[PDB]
């Protein structure tokens, strides 16, 4: 077994070095009340890690347009980052255009409990999805053998926004649930007094006193995370080894 | 700020009780030649974590075809599991056939890690996928807010099980990668000697030595692969609320 | 094999969770000036439980004129509680007014010592009579198979009082104690002057020096004990389980 | 806070000294296939101590009629509690045939918990409830200024051999449950095979899935455990202190 | 300060993985009755870093002619090595033939003491000269901004063989010392007798009794190590830079 | 299995014997803006120690130039220091200038690691290159049997200077380095913006934006330490054991 | 404080490296039957240091008649002993025939507790006499300042012997004892039967029965130990700095 | 094993009984600028320790002209001190003017290292030679069975308080030395320059630059010096036995 950080904790406070320079987690993105999706990859110039790396690059747009920062990790140094950078450029035609950690020591891999049995030296492909007070909302850990599927990280980040923002949870499979489909749920009494007062109000669509919701996303939100997936679920129109 | 079993470890030995009766993980499902999904939620009788156990169960039949069972978690006693999944099929018309772990001193939360910062009672919604030789291969930690998307993780299973007969590794967003498609990645050579036996071979398509694929998945594999990912993206025809 | 509070500490200091919100133990009960009884069970929507909540409710008014409070606990959720109460409003036709602990990951009950060998997971049928000075004042152990005798806790409470306020002793049996019936007794000397002094004041009925009693007690308070111990005797008029 | 022995474990073995003679605890009655009650008084010679003994004297056939033993316990002398038997049996004309346990350096009142914070050097009115297998089935504490329900006691005993013998728990108040009556509980179903088996039974008088019940017992049994709790409920024809 | 293996010693025992395959040290080297220069450095693709592999590239034959092997080290992974191997025969025309460890956590590293305070992630230049026994001879510490001079290496290993075959020490500057040349040193005498019998014997060169010397390396011998610093003192009439 | 001072670190504070005297190192080098190279040898009045001692004396203005100062070290005694530097200038024809620490029980040996496993009772011929910062640059671990070369210690020191004042890291064998001669490397970029900046200034001659190097040394200055090298390779012109 | 060997213990067990060659003490001089008297001397080439040795080398005839070794120790290395053994031989005309101990770590001088406060650095001037069984006897700690009586150490040894072959002890200033000359002491009785028989036997010289002697030493046992004190109470005829 | 006080430590702080009363050491002398020599003997009423007694009492005003102070030492108590003194004066004639030190349970022995491996109960004959500044000058341990010779007590106090007001080393048995006879020695140069300034001034007698010696002691002084050795020497005139 292993340590990690835990969802709801504080992102670990530590200075890295990436091939942008030298920042502070998670205050640089707190400090510019952007959320960052912290990703690990075993090393640079390998073939699956590759891959994710133009993924989230062709998603760029779709992070910043939710206000989200990207920043990659690995044990490889920041002239492996460059060079690796400068070849997926040069031979994909896609540009990367946010930093990679450099952890040479694991000194920042063992503190996010990125070293899993698979391998000693390696970190797996693990995700922080950490919102804009630096707080862990999310964490995924993928093994070597397996690329992620980076549209689930755009609805993760998307769907936990509108929670926020509407006071809401998030059914499974939003927006596309088979009970309520974009319906948000609202959080359920944790009281006799709330129970009956969510009974006598006929303000929610409800199953039962816990099991209340309502549709109050916009149809652009709702649309821009069914775009999400639609686009996981799409053959590519061209494959970019292609036009390599 | 706690501790986890890891990727690549057996998963750890004990006996739980379900609603189904006392077995021990993973030797239950390990004795059957099954790999297992075991996911947690925070309690029973909560809006999104029945929407994730109607979305299972709608998925139980694509998990058995893949030779995986489910098994679900909560700190909620036995009765209180009978009970819920009562309540599930009158009111959404959805039966449950599969167990769900009672854990109300937190015994086993505490040694899978499943106890975070968010709540100090319940759990959060993790989710263990675990092969038939008991060796974890997948960890994913979502939050009390948010649903899981259950379509990921029949991917993962699907891909997983690709990867391991193929002798593959699986690119992002497989089956639908925009560099190679559905292809699947040769792991790159380790030594110089198998770098150049790799260039010399003409045997793979290839961007560099360390960037080989082929597409070894059968088309059957790959649109089960590409159902699950489209199910994911479309709004259902019919949501279960209205006939409730 | 096990911790516990002890009679003459004060109850251990704690904020608990409960279907009515969030209390801090003792103090919420101290700051009114009344006695508390807590008690515990080992799991909601258990039928020697259930009868217990429906003996504690049909005796609630008795509770009160005494100046206790009632507050149970067990390892299940605030939604269980409130769907057991529910259950039992619906079934048995008794409305539960009080409280009731959640405590899933067993804080409360390692703290109180209400795990014992008979169950590794459900606290046992402990009841904690705490005086308005947040003292412990007497402690109950029922098993798992056994319901308690709630006409017992209402005659400690009543006795308790009576001998605080009285300065008295309480024989076994009170108030039918077959050697002295409602008679309490004075606490005996403890030294010789104090001996001599008793034997020689003829202030009370008296076996011995260190065996004096008097009936301070009024007509009221004695017909009010004996109530208790009638109801625990006679074989109630009607069955709540025939108006289902 | 202190130490106790558990419900569901074996009183603890140990040899002790009583006014009969050494015996070693629980074999001494396991191996007469016994249940013993042993309970505790902080001093010999102390009034509200003497009526509880006379409580037990007067109710001996009684626990002899259900298969139980006696034993005292205080940290007097052996030659106190001889002094203590004959002053009761000269005083109050009543015979105690039971022994006593002399603990005067408090081993005893250590190893079961019986010393609390009312008293550095007198241990509390403990009464363990011990079955013919050793175990430890019920324990009671009550204070120094507070006699015993020697009643209860008795109704205690019968109702766990009741419950033993034809496989049931008790509800509470148990021969006058305001639900129930004089029926015993069928323990609930654990597994949603055996839920649905009960219901689909018609075996049993149910409430729910949960809460079955039937009247096994005779009438017998019945009117004995009631005739306990009207004697409780009984002023006394005559007072012992009358007879002098 | 930090620890490191030291001159007498064994070369710690240890598996290494390097772009040649999986080794065991010093046993690889030992079983072939081969000499081994262990050589680290701060990361692939830095300039002094690839102006020192290829120094050593270029004196290859040199070693291989002296039964010495070489063996690089840094914190990078092996496809980092495999790359930059690649990149110094495409861009400056020189195959690096020996093989580079990868210690992505710095295990290595750190077993060796090759963690210095210029650096907490990358390996100062350190360089062990182990024999064909195993053992630690000669340990140099180069900084990162300082390139070693490999001649002085070759002329380390050179005269470190020459000593062990002859039974011989080796003056400062050998084979240019400016009080005996060529020569060799004989062990100075440790005893009385061995003093006496060392100055009455007139077999060798003396300055004083511990001061004794022969000539007996070959012309062959001494004509390569004066070519090795004649290398190191000539100005290269072609630079590499201009080829490229 | 010895602890080390590290390249990077102050010198060790400490008070040490010499037969010039007490001195503070580095606190004596440092106060007068001078390096100084720290050396010691196993024993005094052995035949290798004497030909390093002669080596350096005859170097003597060569680090003087160098603003360098040299102070050596045995486990002898200063009477053993002052007779054998008697001996060398009686015997060699050279005076040995600097002064010897006297570290008798191997208090000084032990503080920097000059205790190996070749001899428990000497020193190493270990080297500390100290700058006027007092800060340790360079260490080197010669063994006993091996003379060391006394112009590559000139060499680094000289190279560091040139380093430290023109901002540059030194190549390989400089300044006769194979692929950019006498030039001096420009550190690496260690962030995209700064290679790609490098890359487009057209600044330096560069091999790739991570390569780049000019000349910047004077004429003088690659002369200097050419020098050192030219004459390590010289055959010496007369023997001083002839002219003895 | 310091830690040393004790009389009456055996003499540590220990190889030692002399200008003779490696031994074994005590068991070099035990399996000879010899005597040895171990002594300490701060550093050779020191004056009142060379002082003694050419005592000793006086007495060397007499120490070897009594059967009684010698070996020398200082902190300096073998080569120094050599040299400085040779000083004298050249300088005052008198040879060192017996070895002197190397120990430049201290680690012998550790083991005898000879470093002191005076020095950190040098040993004092300590004297262990062993006898033929490697049993201390006696232990003289001399300071840095002081030379030692070198005809008390033959008068210890010759005393001692005496003692042992004839069992008795030896009074104050023997052979010139004020109080009996040159008569040796019969132990006294430490029982009333041996005080008795003792007082009864006419069989020695008394002055009580705890102070009995007689004259069992030969005249030339006693000329001998006379002839040590004549030589240490006699001005010198010619003194040897007048010839050296 | 043993632990000693050493030369150079100031002499253990302690309050002591003596026949004569309380005093502190080594203040109590210190105070008064006095030296002293603390002795120790197995048991009063022996008779070596006896002989040593009448020495020391004989050598009283030799040691009080040289401002030198006698405490003995044994584990006896003060009453067998008193009894033994007057045994001496009575049966020998002669007074001991000096205190003992009574140490019944070798409270002062162990501090002082004076329980050695031949007697578990008895002090050996130690000595701790004791300046005015209370400082440990020197330390002789002899046996139960050897008296100790006190004229070279005597020497070595003179010949330390010679050495220290004329800052002087003392050879070898002095005051016959056969190198320099009564000359004392000048400490040797610790420097270069020191020992230049030595040879160049012929300032003083040398043999070397290291051995430089004086007269610088009086007549007196000489004399004094020669007669304590004399007396060691001299066949006693007549024997305390015969008169007495």
Known sequence: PGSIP????????????????VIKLPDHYVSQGKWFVLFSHPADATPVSTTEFVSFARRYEDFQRLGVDLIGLSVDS????IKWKEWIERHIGVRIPFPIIADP???????????????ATHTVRGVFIVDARGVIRT???????LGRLVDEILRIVK?????????????????????????????????????????????????????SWDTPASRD?????RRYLRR?????????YEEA
């Not at 964490?139 to 053998?145: G, T, V």
């Not at 509108?162 to 944790?190: F, H």
């Not at 007094?193 to 669509?205: K, L, P, T, V, W």
């Not at 996981?232 to 970019?240: D, G, V, Y």
């Open 105 to 119: 020591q694991g000194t920042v891999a063992r503190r996010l409990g990125l070293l899993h049995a698979e391998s």
């Open 159 to 211: 769907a936990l926004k509108l929670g926020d923002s509407l006071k809401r949870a998030v059914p499974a499979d939003w927006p596309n649930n088979e009970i309520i489909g974009e319906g948000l749920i609202v959080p359920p009494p944790t009281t006799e007094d709330q129970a009956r007062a969510r009974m006598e109000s006929g303000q929610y669509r409800s199953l039962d006193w816990w099991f």
């Open 6 to 21: 835990l969802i709801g904790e504080r992102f670990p406070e530590m200075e890295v070095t990436t091939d942008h320079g």
């Open 139 to 145: 964490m995924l850990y993928y093994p070597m053998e």
């Open 221 to 225: 939100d709702v649309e821009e995370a």
């Open 78 to 81: 920041v002239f492996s980052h």
């Open 232 to 240: 996981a679920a799409e053959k590519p129109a061209k494959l970019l």
